[PDB]
Curated annotation (Swiss-Prot):
It comes from Homo sapiens (Human). The chain holds residues 875 to 1058 of 1430 of the full protein. This is FYVE, RhoGEF and PH domain-containing protein 6. May activate CDC42, a member of the Ras-like family of Rho- and Rac proteins, by exchanging bound GDP for free GTP. May play a role in regulating the actin cytoskeleton and cell shape. It is found in: Cytoplasm; Cytoplasm, Cytoskeleton. Residues 6-189 form the DH domain.
Length: 189
């Protein structure tokens, strides 16, 4: 059925998106930590790294849990055809993507500055980008994914709503979830 197919695509694309958040918050951060242990001192100041990886601990925790809830829903779809309440519940936290989007250009410029002016950090970034984990895509490519994810939620939830029955089941929560994600998406303007 169309609603289940679209909900499955929300889940499957969320698996990929959470893997990007892992790449940034866990794998890249671990690479910096590894270089810092090799050197015996931080290769970059924590406060600067955390601004480059802006809100990534919060976003990783938020979407890791969103994903696991979606996975539970899709495993039990026969008995309960609902996903949108999960987005509505997490609304206050999804609003963190608004500041992520609004600060993106400044935080990418900070990444660029730090790679040009801090050679130990530049080396970690380049070696990570060339590693199989990144597959020779720049860190900025992955840091853009949260910006791109919010319009994807909008498209997917709009298609989901189109295939629901009015004022039954997940319909009203899908409307409210769409309102949350549109408010976030507008910060790209």
């Amino acid at each position: 059925g169309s609603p289940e197919f679209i909900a499955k695509e929300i889940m499957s694309s969320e698996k990929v998106f959470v893997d990007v958040l892992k790449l940034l918050h866990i794998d890249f951060r671990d690479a910096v930590a590894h270089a810092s242990r090799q050197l015996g001192k931080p290769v970059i100041e924590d406060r600067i790294l955390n601004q480059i990886l802006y809100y990534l601990p919060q976003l990783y925790e938020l979407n890791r849990d969103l994903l696991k809830e979606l996975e539970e829903r899709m495993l039990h779809w026969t008995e309960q055809q609902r996903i949108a309440d999960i987005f509505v519940k997490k609304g206050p936290y999804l609003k963190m993507y608004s500041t992520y989007i609004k600060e993106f250009d400044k935080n990418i410029a900070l990444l660029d500055e730090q790679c040009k002016k801090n050679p130990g950090f530049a080396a970690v970034v380049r070696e990570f980008e060339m590693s199989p984990r990144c597959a020779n895509l720049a860190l900025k490519h992955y840091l853009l994914k949260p910006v791109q994810r919010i319009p994807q939620y909008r498209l997917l939830l709009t298609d989901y709503l189109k295939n629901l029955i009015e004022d039954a089941g997940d319909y009203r929560d899908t409307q409210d979830a769409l309102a949350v994600v549109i408010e976030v998406a507008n910060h790209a303007n």
